[PDB]
């Protein structure tokens, strides 16, 4: 019930308008934007822009995972949301309401072990590209971890499994995701033991297979 | 997909999870969701099988039909209900499969230790349990919303001296005069 | 209009709901390439690339002490000038924070995660960020 | 760390000097914590007499706020209180 | 002591990024999810005049026999059967109940559906991102006014307000959140 | 102020209605040392309760089993929570013959949630804006006035005001530039947290005041309006338009719960007085809005939630404009059922882990307990669902036994197509998804 | 009618609007009809310090 | 800006300065009966008042003999100034029986602080804060006489406080005053304006030392239940005082301008010790249907009477619309009859 | 456009998932019927057009009004069932509603007999400690309801408090 006359404070309705010039400008949405500063050129006109895309241009395909703290997981298995008997995957987290569904965007998640030093019970997890110390922690506890990196429709066919009667065949990850995460022997990528087959895939014997192009 | 504690089809790697130290987990959180997941399909059916019973003469031209166009029902069954059954079943299976592990745990203990030591081992009793279930027993804290009615602070309330009145019409009437009020500076 | 008159007897045009704006207008493309906002919330600084830009003749005899490629934060006034365009998504609400410059995964998630979207299977979970589905081989137009 | 030199700037543009580690992620973690003006480079505490800088904006703000008549006098030019009152205002427009 | 040219390593947590090994030696580490405790904070609570004798820091620890001793999760003698809610490297543990078996604490704080404690640090006018924070203790129950008093003996100079559901403490950053929990932990809640 | 210094009261008493002040020994009509805008005694708004509300006894009901009439328990076991009353609430249920048949516990979660005003306000503030005709709030605009387009006179040479195309709010034909059309307004959103929590704290205040009364059945023996008005005289429901009236949450008898009313009562429930009839649930649907960004620009109706709460639910405006609350025992069971899975998820973990011991989590689906007494409609749908539990036998898409073969699948990756296929005994059972 | 009104023994009267007036502010107005005599509306100036 | 206060600063106003009334006994209640339940000619008082304040200043200085004299005079001029057994002439000796006891003369002390009570019970309604000041002197001169049997009068003195001291009216007005401040970061010392019951309610402060001088007794004699019989009472005495001060926080930040809210904040507010005592269910408003137009469905004759009058119908608003909307509502007046007939 | 047609006829009752923004915080007893007959109307008036649509539409596309064509006309002749899951029909689910209505009418019949037992078992004439009002007085307009339980007059309390004997 008052008028925030700038540089003068709240004023009564029916009060004095003699000193509300720049206020009648702000209400009209008219923005000068400090443009009387012709003399001093801002960083805007003198800032070389790298990366014709941008500093953090999230082009299609950029593998930007949504961070999942490891300490948020170990807090939900002793609270009682997660049953440590079973191979904890992305389906439970969404259904155990451990993490909201606004967090999960392709590619799914990432397990980060910061300010966590030990994990007492063995744990078996399927996430996309946990960090290094997050992996070593789980491996040191008897439990294990794998890197289930998958295409988009792999995420949907997994997070909503009660919408498919049978197993629609799931496409391999693309090349930039293959060599980085899935085929990575170090990151426990799931396609690593297959890429290291040698007998096939790591070197054919099938005629079509021989051309990686086919 | 995963959705059951077996590992998804992504065990094409030799990542079969062995040496599972079989823990005793009582499915306390799961058994709620199933109780909810079961309550949905039980209603998702009720919505699916609503037939008109319009209590008004104007809308008595449809008084014995399903409220949902035949397509919209076979559509509601194959989409918005058959995913409410694969849900409870996914909940139900994830519990019947775990209770098979509570079997081995409670049956490897009944043969090594006393029923006195089990309800100390496989029981999640807590020092303040009565604060939520049987509140007549708890005294270590004042858990009441109306704390001023707890026994330990009931003295704070007044004890008025009331009395009925016959000529007032059964009106009850506190028999204490009102303290002289403050009126001026 | 009083009660009834030739200005209301007849029937000029009528007006319906106004369409909205793009939800993220105020993160203008011209900034998403100049700056990058860094730091913890309540310490958001907008750093921009630092150093001269002139393209001399064939001089430039030192490439090593050439531009050091450092991000240095923009002048404190202008950060408030641009950020002022970001707050006006929900004015009058001390609650909310400024809409960030670059999108965040919770923003890209919460956008299509409402109840109203729960059945939009495609485009859910950021389908527009993944590489496309391998189209059919008997595909044709 | 006592300086006794023309100390330096910070680690904006960095030539990394390794000793032994994993260390395969230094200049990708030395330009990652360098833009937020930060540690994870140890920050090299220099210039132990940074008091003379806290005593400049002590003077460069007590000699420029007195450029507008510092005035522990009053609400300036009272002359109409000192009888008694509750001063109202005078909008600036100036 | 500038003769030791080391000690540069002890530097700040303001104006400079703080993470990993370099976390401030006063700044606590109790987060929402990693309920870490500290002995420094616990002595302040144990050397302050208050009723409601806190719990001994001995019997307050959630973190410090087949194959030479087994973990606290009741991994059973077979080194096989283990029990769900018994060990937690994240610091979780149920309440311990009040330490004085002759006293009736007048307020009962109620942990939340995820096992938290009701203190959350908000900001005054977050729109302009103002670095002025307060607290709010939402899950209080019981004689929440006699809960306000105990906060005064800990926070004598903080503007403390009280409503039917919450208890606001003003000008309390993320640190006064940690100091609050160590009280509600030691208090047996 | 303090103008009109004379001429208010004629300086004389009335004929036989004005009484001077005898003295401080007698009592006047209305006097009370508390500020009460609606002053009521136990004759005008008589609370239907065993005791009389008091600061001594926490609620005007039995807190302990009176042994001269049988004791019923709630359907679902009771766990006490944050706002609960922490004491038994045993409430004598009534009979349509104005009797007291049996006594019955009341779930502290629903009926013992101690009220708070800063939340029942959100219930009322939501209603006073939701219960509001928006389409009536329609005014013209500048561009709906049908006047000439040209400046109604050359702005300079005329001895007039500098104005062109006079169709503005200053004139008696113009209209506001930014007027109030329906779709500009707001239908506020309201989730399940703050709707239930608000409502449960209203059926508690209706207890703490003593205006609560559980009833066995609300059926009229015949569908007339006579049997309705006669049912209120015997049971004592002052329902005249001026005197405070009853609020009828209706759910059928104890053994025959029913979310819908009884055609006998429903038809007799219509009477121009202070009577209401509401649905036997406190929870409500999850709020959605599709036209959230004015996408459908052909819409009429307020911005905000496009899923408003229907008027016949239990709100805070008719929770107080109708004094007596009249719940049926069928309505009780549904409240305890739908709120059950709600109070359990609203517990701390260390306590939620003791429920499977105390018989809180006996799953009617794993057979660990015979099926609980369910609503007539929601059991009918459980007999249907149980009936067809067999038709999905011969198909691999069965919902009750999904993925029968997840033990024999032999997943095989090929690198000519982007395919991970699975074989069940050397026969491919994956399905290439159509496009 | 929201007005307290006193009748003085010379026929004079006075009213005191108590609309929106709390109980404490009615008693104060109660005690202010018994006080005055309702005989003269005199301005407290230096000339009218003495009525006779 | 600040204020130097180097000139004379006239006082501020505040609701802590209201003239709080005294405290008495109810009408018929007499002291000796309540206990066993558990113009004037000129006298220079204004000058002797200065003559006893030099006793209150003296007896509080350790000069207990000189104080006795100053009290002697002022106790003489009072038994002449006021009539017999006046509430004042009884109270001055309570400063004399103390000044006696602090000079060895306990024999006259009890002879004095017992003389007052016959001036108190024999009165009409005695000053309640005095009968707790006498029953304290009677309890202290018994200590000086070293008689443990003569020590169970404290607990009997406070038996009158707990019974006859409505502990609300001390902090009735001061209860909402924190809702008066409207600034949050400057002059915010008004949101915490705290007035202390020891400094504002003397009878409460008196009743405290009783229940602290009574504890030291039972502590001295190595009495166990006696100590607890007091300590729990000393807490129950204060707990029902801190309760009458509680209140929730209204707005917290700086509300600007709404200065006219100065009427809803500072006003007569029902104290928590009263809002329950006189609850609208225990203490029922008397409503005489002779002056109203409503009564329960059976008491239909007892309304404010009228003149020649015949009930036309119920004012169903659709009686105005066309006759087809009055062909409905036909029997709704018939049906409603026998609903209000017994 | 997008308006959630997959939620319209999917309420439990017939008043949800429908924008009744034109409400009124007091609906007269004449204006509540009309609100019921309203919400009851635009569920039948809604679909009785979406049935007339899809039946008149098949008649024009050359099918059976229900949607059957040539093939699924033959299968019913051969004795083969045509649709995968035959969902319970009108006569089906309007028959289950005559189960949970018929056992309850029999369970609520016998409950008359079991209530009389446990009510004519513990049948005192002097009420227990609940007849006290040392804390809070009693509701005399309620005592008229406990009166039919005993024989001793509970409906007469003296003006003095009742100690509860």
**Strand F71-72 relative to strand F99-105, pairing:** parallel
Question: How far is Cα F421 from Cα F415, in angstroms, rounded to an integer?
Answer: 11
CA F100 to each of CA B140, C17, F57, H82: distance values in angstroms, whole numbers, following the listed order: 38, 58, 21, 67
Task: For chain E, say whether C94 makes contact (Cβ under 8 Å).
Answer: yes
Token pair, residue H13, equals 């106003």
Q: Is F228 exposed, middle or buried (0-12, 13-18, 19+ CB in 10 A)?
A: buried
Which residues from A are below 8 Å from H257, CB to CB?
1-2, 10, 12
Q: Is F378 exposed, middle or buried (0-12, 13-18, 19+ CB in 10 A)?
A: buried
Q: What is the DSSP string of C34-72?
A: TEEEESSTT--EEEEE-S-----SS----SSSS----EE
F195 annotated to bind ligand: no
Neighbours of chain H (3+ CB pairs under 8 A): A, B, E, F, G, I
Neighbours of F245 (CB within 10 A): 22
**Cα–Cα distance, C100 to C27 (Å, whole number):** 8
By DSSP bridging, strand A124-127 and strand A144-147 are: parallel
Minimal CA separation from A169 to chain D, in Å: 38
- CA-nearest of C83, C46, C48, C50 to C67 is C50
**Cα–Cα dist G39/G49, whole Å:** 16
Helix (H, G, I), strand (E, B) or coil at E137: strand
I22:F135 CB<8 A? yes
Query: What is the C-alpha separation between F58 and E145, in angstroms, rounded?
Result: 20
Helices B70-78 and I29-61 meet at what angle, rounded to 10?
90
Q: What tokens does A208 get?
A: 């079509």
Would you say the C-alpha torsion F74, F75, F77, F81 has a positive or negative sign?
negative
CA F101 – CA F94 distance, rounded (Å): 6
Tell me how far apart the alpha carbons of residues F372 and B165 are, in angstroms, rounded to a whole number.
50
H/E Cβ contact: 3+ pairs below 8 Å = yes
Report d(CA F255, CA I109) in Å as an integer: 10
Q: Which residues contact A161 (CB under 8 A, 6 or more apart)?
A: A91, B1, B2, B3, B86, B90
Q: d(Cα B109, Cα H41) in Å, to the nearest integer?
A: 100
Please state, in angstroms and rounded to a whole number, the distance separating the CA atoms of residues F220 and F237: 15
Give SS3 for F200.
helix
Residue with tokens 């929201």: G2
DSSP string, F140-156: --GGGS---SS-SS-TT
Q: How far is residue E52 from each of residues B60, D13, E99, E107, F70, measured CA to CA in Å?
A: 71, 57, 8, 11, 44
Q: Which helix (H) or strand (E) holds E67?
A: none
Cα torsion angle, A177, A183, A186, A190, sign: positive
Query: Is residue D88 within 8 angstroms of chain E, CB to CB?
Result: no
- Non-local (6+) Cβ contacts of C58 within 8 A are none
Do F and E make contact, counting contact as 3+ CB pairs within 8 angstroms? yes
Q: Are A123 and B5 in contact (CB under 8 A)?
A: no
Q: What residues does A66 pair with on adjacent strands?
A: A109
Q: How far is CA H253 from CA E127, F121, H62, H176, in A?
A: 16, 21, 50, 17
A7 inside 8 A of chain D by CB: yes
Euclidean distance between CA atoms H223 and H47, whole angstroms: 48
Contact A128, A107 (CB under 8 A): yes
- Chain B closest CA to E51's CA: distance in Å? 13
Asked if residues F396 and A184 have their Cβ atoms less than 8 Å apart, the reply is no
The chains in contact with chain A, meaning 3 or more Cβ pairs closer than 8 Å, are B, C, D, E, F, H
Reduce the DSSP state of residue F349 to 3 states and report it: helix
Measured distance CA(H99)–CA(H105) in Å, rounded: 9
Rg (chain A; Cα; Å):
27
Using CA atoms, how far residue I121 sits from C59, F90, I112, I125, in Å, is 113, 20, 14, 12
* Alpha-carbon distance values, F337 to E13, F91, H255 (Å): 53, 19, 45
Give CA–CA dist B139/B150, Å, rounded.
10
Cα H237 to Cα H215: distance, rounded to the nearest angstrom = 14
Is the CB of B127 less than 8 angstroms away from the CB of E105?
no
Q: How do A109-112 and A66-69 pair as beta strands?
A: parallel
Q: Which of F123, I44, B66 is nearest to I36 (CA)?
A: I44
In chain A, the residue whose alpha carbon lies closest to the alpha carbon of H258 is A1
Task: For residue F397, say whether it is annotated as part of any ligand binding site.
Answer: yes
Q: A interface toward H at CB cutoff 8 Å?
A: 1-2, 10, 12
- For residue I66, what are its two tokens? 């229900």
Using CA atoms, how far apart are residues E55 and E61, in angstroms rounded to an integer?
Answer: 10
Cβ atoms < 10 Å from Cβ of E153: 11
How many beta-carbon pairs under 8 angstroms link B with G? 9
Task: State how far the Cα of D41 lies from the Cα of D13, in Å rounded to an integer.
Answer: 12
β strands within F183-269, DSSP E: 186-187, 212-215, 246-249
Asked if the Cβ–Cβ distance from B54 to I160 is below 8 Å, we say no
Helices (H), F210-364: 226-235, 263-268, 318-321, 329-338, 340-345, 349-352
Q: Which residue of E33, E117, E163, E165 is the best one to mutate when testing the F interface, meaning the one whose CB has the most F CBs within 10 A? A: E165
Contact H154, H210 (CB under 8 A): yes
Q: How far is CA F286 from the centre of its chain?
A: 13
**Beta-strand relationship, F186-187 and F303-304:** parallel
Residues of A in contact with C124 (CB under 8 A): 156
Chains C and A, touching by 3 or more CB pairs within 8 angstroms = yes
Asked if B112 is an interface residue toward chain H (Cβ–Cβ < 8 A), one would say no
Q: What's the CA dihedral at A53, A54, A59, A63 to 10 degrees?
A: 140
Other CB atoms closer than 10 Å to residue H270's CB: what's the count?
16
Neighbours of chain C (3+ CB pairs under 8 A): A, D, E, F, I
Peptide bond into A99 cis (omega under 30): no
DSSP H helical segments within chain E, as ranges?
Answer: 39-46, 144-154, 174-186
Contact predicate B22/E81, CB 8 Å: yes
Kind of pairing, strands F212-215 and F324-328? parallel
Are the beta carbons of F410 and F422 closer than 8 angstroms?
A: yes
- Which residues on chain F are in Cβ contact (under 8 Å) with I27? 311
Q: How far apart are CA H240 and CA H238, in angstroms?
A: 5
Euclidean distance between CA atoms H237 and H233, whole angstroms: 6
Count interface pairs A-B at CB distance under 8 A: 100
The chains in contact with chain G, meaning 3 or more Cβ pairs closer than 8 Å, are B, F, H
The Cα–Cα gap between I40 and I34 comes to 9
State the Cα–Cα distance between residues H250 and C29, nearest whole angstrom.
46
State how far the alpha carbon of H334 is from the alpha carbons of A10, F271, F276, in Å: 62, 12, 21
Q: Is A16 on the interface with D (CB under 8 A)?
A: yes
Indicate the SS3 state at residue H49. helix
Size of interface A-E (CB pairs under 8 A): 51
Q: Which bin fits E51, alpha (ψ -120 to 50), beta or left (φ > 0)?
A: beta
Cross-strand bridge partners of residue C38 = C45
Q: With 0-12 CB in 10 A as exposed, 13-18 as middle and 19+ as buried, what is A128?
A: buried
What's phi and psi for F180, nearest 5 deg?
-100, 95
Residue E83 bridge partners (DSSP):
B24
Of H321, F248, F232, residue with least CA distance to I32: F248
Tokens of H146: 């070293």
Whether the upstream peptide bond of residue A107 has omega within 30° of 0, thus cis, is: yes
| Residues in chain I closer than 8 A to H314 (CB atoms) | none
Which of A6, A12, A15, A19 is the best mutation test for D, with the most CBs of D within 10 A?
A: A19
Please give the Cα distance from E85 to F350 (Å, whole number): 8
* Contact of B155 with H256, CB cutoff 8 Å: no
Q: Cβ–Cβ of C69/D36 closer than 8 Å? A: no
- Tell me the Cα Rg of chain D: 26
Say whether H248 and E164 touch across the interface (CB within 8 A).
yes
Q: SS3 sequence, chain B? A: CCCCCCCCHHHHCCCCCCCCCCEECCCCCHHHHHHHHHHHHHHHHHHHCCECCCCCCCCCCCCCCECCCHHHHHHHHHCCCHHHHHHHHHHHHHHHHHHHHHHHHHHHHCCCCCHHHHCCCCCCCCCCHHHCCCCCCCCCECCCCCHHHCHHHHHHCCCCCEEECCCCCCCEEECCCCCCCCCCC
Biggest alpha carbon distance in chain D?
80
By C-alpha distance, which of H132, H63, H55 is closest to H95?
A: H55
In order of F227, F253, H341, the CA distances from H313 in angstroms are 21, 36, 15
- Cβ contact, residue pair C38, D12, below 8 Å: no
G-proximal residues of B, 122-181, CB under 8 Å: 181
Asked whether the beta carbons of residue B1 and residue A126 sit closer than 8 angstroms, the reply is: no
Q: Give partners of D (≥3 CB pairs < 8 A).
A: A, C, E
Residue B25 in contact with residue E84, Cβ under 8 Å?
Answer: yes
Q: Which residues contact C1 (CB under 8 A, 6 or more apart)?
A: C7, C8, F140, F145, F172, F173, F174, F175
Please give the Cα distance from H53 to A137 (Å, whole number): 81
**Residue contact C1–F175, C-beta within 8 A:** yes
Beta strand spans in E19-117 (E)? 82-83
Q: Spell out which residues of chain H touch residue G24, defining contact as CB-CB under 8 Å.
A: 267-268
Question: Which residue has 């008694």 as its token pair?
Answer: D84
Could you tell me how far CA H340 lies from the centroid of its own chain? 48
> Rounded to whole angstroms, how far apart are CA atoms E72 and A59?
48
**What are the backbone dihedrals phi and psi of residue H31, each rounded to the nearest 5 degrees, phi first?**
-65, -55
Which chain B residue lies closest to E106 (C-alpha atoms)? Answer: B142
Distance CA I132, CA I164 (A): 4
Beta-strand ranges (E) seen in chain C are 35-38, 45-49, 71-73
Element (H, E) at C81: helix C76-87
Chain I residue with minimum CA distance to F133: I22
Inter-chain CB proximity D40 and E20 less than 8 Å = yes
Helix (H) / strand (E) containing G25 = helix G24-35
Q: Which residue spans within F96-198 are E strands per DSSP? A: 99-105, 186-187
E121 in Cβ contact with B157 (< 8 Å) = no
State which residue of chain H sits closest to B161, comparing Cα positions: H277
CA distance F360 to F370: 14
> Which chain B residues are Cβ-neighbours of I10 within 8 angstroms?
47, 76, 80
A10 strand-pairing partners: A4
Contact (Cβ atoms closer than 8 angstroms) between residue E140 and residue E166: yes
Q: Which of H244, H241, H222 is nearest to H172 (CA)?
A: H244
Question: Experimental method for this entry?
Answer: cryo-EM
Residues 6 or more apart whose CB falls under 8 angstroms from that of E147 comprise: E106, E107, E137, E140, E167
Distance from CA of C22 to the nearest CA of F (A): 9
What element of type H or E holds B172?
A: strand B172-174
Question: Can you list the alpha helix ranges (DSSP code H) found in E128-168?
Answer: 144-154
F82 in contact with E at a CB cutoff of 8 Å? yes
Give resolution, Å, one decimal.
3.4
Residue entry with tokens 């200053």: F170
């Amino acid at each position: 019930s008052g008028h925030n006359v700038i540089k003068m404070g709240w004023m009564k309705i029916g009060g004095s308008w003699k000193y509300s010039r720049s206020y009648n400008d702000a209400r009209r949405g008219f923005a000068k934007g400090q443009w009387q500063e012709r003399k001093m050129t801002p960083r805007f006109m003198l800032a070389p822009r790298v990366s014709a895309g941008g500093p953090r241009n999230r082009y299609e395909g950029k593998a930007s995972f949504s961070r999942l703290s490891l300490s948020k997981l170990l807090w939900a298995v002793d609270t009682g949301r997660l049953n440590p008997n079973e191979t904890i995957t992305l389906y439970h987290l969404r259904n155990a309401k451990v993490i909201a569904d606004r967090e999960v965007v392709w590619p799914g998640m990432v397990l980060l072990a910061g300010n966590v030093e030990r994990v007492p019970y063995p744990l078996h997890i399927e996430l996309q590209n946990a960090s290094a110390k997050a992996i070593q922690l789980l491996e040191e506890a008897g439990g294990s971890f794998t890197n289930v990196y998958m295409s988009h429709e792999g995420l949907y066919q997994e997070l909503h499994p009660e919408e498919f009667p049978t197993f629609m065949e799931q496409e391999l990850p693309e090349r930039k995701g293959l060599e980085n995460f899935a085929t990575n022997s170090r990151k426990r990528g799931w396609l690593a033991q297959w890429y290291e087959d040698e007998s096939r895939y790591a070197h054919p014997g099938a005629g079509r297979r021989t051309a990686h192009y086919i | 997909s995963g959705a059951v504690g077996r590992g998804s089809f992504h065990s094409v790697v030799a990542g079969a999870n062995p040496r599972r130290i079989p823990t005793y987990y009582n499915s306390a959180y799961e058994l709620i969701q199933l109780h909810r997941a079961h309550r949905e399909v039980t209603r998702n059916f009720l919505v699916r099988d609503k037939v008109f019973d319009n209590k008004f003469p104007g809308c008595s031209l449809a008084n014995g039909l399903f409220k949902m166009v035949p397509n919209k029902r076979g559509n509601f069954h194959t989409r918005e209900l058959t995913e409410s059954i694969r849900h409870r079943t996914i909940w139900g299976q994830r519990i019947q499969q775990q209770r098979t592990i509570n079997a081995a745990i409670l049956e490897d203990a009944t043969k090594v230790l006393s029923p006195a030591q089990m309800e100390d081992r496989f029981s999640y009793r807590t020092p303040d349990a009565a604060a939520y279930f049987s509140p007549q027993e708890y005294t270590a804290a004042n858990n009441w919303p109306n704390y001023w009615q707890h026994p330990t602070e009931k003295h704070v309330v007044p004890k008025p001296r009331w009395r009925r009145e016959p000529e007032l019409g059964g009106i009850t009437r506190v028999r204490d005069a009102v303290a002289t009020p403050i009126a001026d500076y | 209009p009083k009660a009834g008159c030739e200005e209301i007897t007849r029937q000029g045009r009528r007006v319906v709901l106004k369409p909205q704006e793009y939800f993220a207008q105020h993160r203008m493309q011209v900034w998403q390439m100049r700056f990058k906002e860094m730091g913890p919330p309540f310490s958001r600084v907008w750093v921009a690339l630092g150093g001269k830009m002139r393209r001399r003749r064939i001089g430039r005899q030192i490439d090593v002490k050439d531009m050091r490629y450092y991000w240095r934060p923009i002048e404190p006034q202008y950060q408030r000038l641009y950020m002022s365009r970001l707050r006006i998504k929900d004015h009058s609400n001390k609650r909310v924070q400024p809409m960030r410059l670059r999108a965040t995964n919770n923003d890209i998630g919460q956008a299509s995660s409402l109840k109203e979207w729960e059945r939009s299977s495609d485009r859910k979970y950021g389908a527009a960020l993944a590489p496309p589905k391998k189209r059919d081989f008997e595909f044709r137009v | 760390a006592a300086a006794a030199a023309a100390a330096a700037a910070a680690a904006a543009a960095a030539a990394a000097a390794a000793a032994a580690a994993a260390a395969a992620a230094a200049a990708a973690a030395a330009a990652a914590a360098a833009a937020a003006a930060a540690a994870a480079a140890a920050a090299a505490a220099a210039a132990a007499a940074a008091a003379a800088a806290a005593a400049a904006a002590a003077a460069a703000a007590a000699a420029a706020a007195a450029a507008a008549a510092a005035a522990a006098a009053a609400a300036a030019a009272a002359a109409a209180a000192a009888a008694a009152a509750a001063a109202a205002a005078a909008a600036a427009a100036a | 002591y500038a003769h030791t040219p080391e000690l540069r390593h002890m530097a700040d947590g303001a104006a400079m990024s703080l993470s990993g090994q370099r976390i401030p030696l006063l700044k606590p580490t109790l987060s929402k999810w990693s309920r870490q405790l500290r002995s420094d904070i616990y002595d302040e609570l144990l050397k302050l005049p208050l009723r409601y004798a806190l719990h001994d820091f001995r019997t307050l620890q959630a973190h410090i026999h087949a194959s030479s001793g087994l973990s606290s999760a009741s991994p059973d003698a077979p080194a096989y059967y283990a029990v769900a809610g018994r060990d937690s490297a994240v610091g979780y543990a149920p309440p311990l109940g009040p330490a004085d078996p002759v006293d009736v604490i007048p307020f009962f704080v109620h942990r939340s559906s995820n096992g938290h404690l009701p203190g959350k640090v908000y900001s005054m006018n977050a729109k302009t991102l103002m670095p002025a924070f307060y607290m709010r203790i939402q899950n209080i129950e019981g004689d929440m006014f006699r809960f306000e008093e105990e906060l005064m003996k800990i926070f004598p100079t903080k503007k403390i307000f009280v409503r039917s559901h919450s208890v606001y403490v003003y000008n309390v950053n993320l640190d006064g959140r940690a100091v609050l929990h160590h009280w509600l932990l030691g208090l047996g809640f | 102020y303090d103008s009109r210094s004379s001429g208010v009261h004629d300086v004389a008493p009335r004929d036989g209605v004005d009484f001077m002040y005898e003295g401080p020994q007698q009592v006047l009509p209305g006097a009370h040392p508390l500020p009460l805008f609606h002053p009521d005694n136990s004759v005008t708004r008589p609370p239907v309760s065993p005791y009389l509300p008091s600061p001594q006894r926490p609620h005007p009901y039995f807190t302990t089993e009176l042994p001269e009439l049988p004791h019923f328990q709630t359907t679902r076991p009771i766990v006490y929570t944050v706002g609960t009353m922490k004491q038994r609430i045993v409430a004598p249920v009534f009979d349509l013959a104005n009797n007291v048949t049996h006594t019955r516990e009341l779930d502290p979660f629903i009926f013992g949630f101690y009220p708070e005003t800063e939340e029942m306000a959100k219930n009322l503030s939501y209603w006073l804006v939701r219960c509001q005709n928006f389409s009536s709030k329609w005014d013209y605009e500048n561009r709906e006035i049908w006047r000439k387009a040209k400046k109604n006179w050359p702005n300079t040479g005329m001895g007039m005001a500098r104005v062109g195309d006079r169709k503005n709010h200053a004139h008696p034909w113009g209209a506001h530039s930014k007027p109030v059309k329906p779709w500009n307004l707001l239908m506020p959103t309201m989730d399940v947290k703050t709707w239930s929590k608000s409502n449960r704290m209203l059926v508690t205040l209706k207890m703490l005041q003593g205006k609560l009364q559980i009833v066995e059945r609300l059926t009229l023996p015949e569908p007339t309006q006579e049997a309705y008005l006669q049912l209120c005289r015997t049971m004592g429901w002052d329902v005249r338009h001026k005197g405070g009236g009853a609020l009828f949450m209706d759910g059928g008898s104890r053994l025959t719960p029913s979310s819908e009313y009884d055609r006998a009562f429903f038809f007799g429930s219509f009477f121009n007085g202070r009577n209401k009839l509401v649905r036997p649930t406190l929870l409500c649907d999850e709020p959605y809005d599709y036209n959230r960004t004015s996408s459908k620009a052909r819409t009429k109706g307020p911005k905000g939630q496009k899923n408003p709460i229907p008027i016949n639910r239990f709100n805070a405006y008719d929770a107080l404009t109708h004094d007596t609350l009249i719940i049926t025992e069928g309505a009780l069971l549904q409240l305890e059922d739908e709120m059950y899975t709600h109070k359990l998820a609203m517990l701390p973990p260390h306590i939620r882990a003791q429920l499977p011991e105390r018989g809180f989590l006996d799953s009617e689906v794993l057979g660990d307990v015979p099926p609980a007494l369910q609503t007539v409609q929601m059991e009918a749908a459980a007999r249907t669902e149980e009936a067809e539990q067999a038709m999905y036998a011969p198909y691999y898409d069965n919902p009750y036994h999904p993925w029968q073969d997840e033990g024999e699948a032999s997943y095989a990756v090929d690198a000519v197509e982007g395919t991970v296929q699975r074989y069940i005994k050397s026969r491919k059972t994956s399905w290439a998804m159509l496009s | 009618e929201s007005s307290i009104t006193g009748i003085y023994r010379d026929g004079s009267e006075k009213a005191y609007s108590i609309r929106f007036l709390s109980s404490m502010g009615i008693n104060v107005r109660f005690h202010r009809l018994v006080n005055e005599g309702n005989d003269y509306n005199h301005s407290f100036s230096a000339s009218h310090l003495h009525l006779q | 800006i600040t204020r130097l206060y180097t000139s004379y600063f006239k006082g501020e106003l505040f609701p802590n300065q209201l003239a709080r009334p005294l405290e008495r006994l109810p009408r018929g209640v007499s002291l000796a009966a309540a206990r066993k339940g558990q113009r004037r000619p000129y006298v220079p008082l204004g000058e002797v008042a200065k003559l006893e304040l030099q006793g209150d200043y003296l007896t509080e200085g350790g000069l207990h003999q000189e104080a006795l004299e100053y009290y002697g005079v002022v106790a003489k001029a009072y038994e002449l100034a006021y009539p017999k057994d006046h509430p004042q002439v009884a109270g001055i000796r309570l400063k004399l029986a103390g000044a006696f006891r602090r000079t060895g003369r306990l024999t006259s002390s009890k002879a004095n602080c017992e003389a007052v009570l016959q001036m108190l019970d024999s009165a009409v309604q005695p000053p309640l804060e005095l009968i707790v000041e006498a029953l304290f002197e009677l309890g202290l001169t018994s200590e000086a006489m070293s008689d443990a049997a003569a020590g169970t009068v404290f607990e009997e003195a406070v038996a009158l406080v707990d019974m006859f001291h409505n502990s609300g009216q001390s902090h009735k007005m001061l209860r909402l005053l924190p809702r008066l401040g409207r600034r949050f970061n400057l002059n915010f010392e008004e949101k915490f304006v705290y007035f202390s019951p020891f400094d504002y309610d003397r009878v409460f402060a008196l009743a405290d030392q009783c229940l602290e001088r009574a504890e030291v007794f039972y502590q001295a004699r190595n009495d166990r239940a006696g100590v607890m019989r007091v300590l729990q009472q000393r807490k129950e005495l204060i707990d029902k005082k801190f309760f009458n001060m509680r209140d929730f926080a209204g707005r917290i930040h700086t509300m600007r301008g709404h200065w006219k809210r100065r009427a809803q904040v500072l006003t007569n507010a029902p104290t928590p010790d009263e809002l329950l005592r006189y609850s609208p269910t225990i203490h029922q408003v008397y409503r005489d249907f002779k002056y109203e137009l409503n009564a329960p469905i059976g008491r239909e004759k007892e309304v404010q009477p009228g003149v020649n009058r015949v009930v036309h119908d119920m004012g169903n608003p659709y009686r105005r619309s066309g006759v087809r909307s009055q062909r409905m509502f036909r029997d709704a007046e018939k049906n409603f009859e026998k609903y209000i007939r017994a | 456009g997008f308006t959630m047609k997959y939620k319209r006829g999917t309420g439990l009752w017939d008043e949800d998932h429908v924008n009744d923004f034109d409400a009124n915080k007091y609906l007269s007893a004449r204006s509540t019927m009309r609100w019921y007959y309203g919400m009851e109307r635009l569920q039948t008036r809604n679909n009785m057009n979406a049935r007339r649509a899809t039946q008149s539409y098949n008649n024009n596309m050359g099918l059976h009004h229900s949607g059957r064509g040539a093939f699924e006309r033959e299968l019913e002749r051969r004795g083969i069932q045509v649709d995968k899951y035959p969902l319970t029909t009108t006569t089906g689910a309007a028959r289950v509603a005559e189960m949970v209505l018929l056992r309850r009418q029999e369970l609520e019949a016998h409950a008359k007999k079991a209530m009389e037992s446990q009510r004519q078992a513990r049948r005192r004439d002097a009420p227990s400690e609940w007849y006290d009002e040392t804390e809070g007085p009693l509701n005399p307009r309620f005592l008229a309801s406990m009166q039919s339980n005993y024989t001793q007059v509970i409906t007469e309390l003296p003006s003095s408090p009742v100690t509860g004997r």
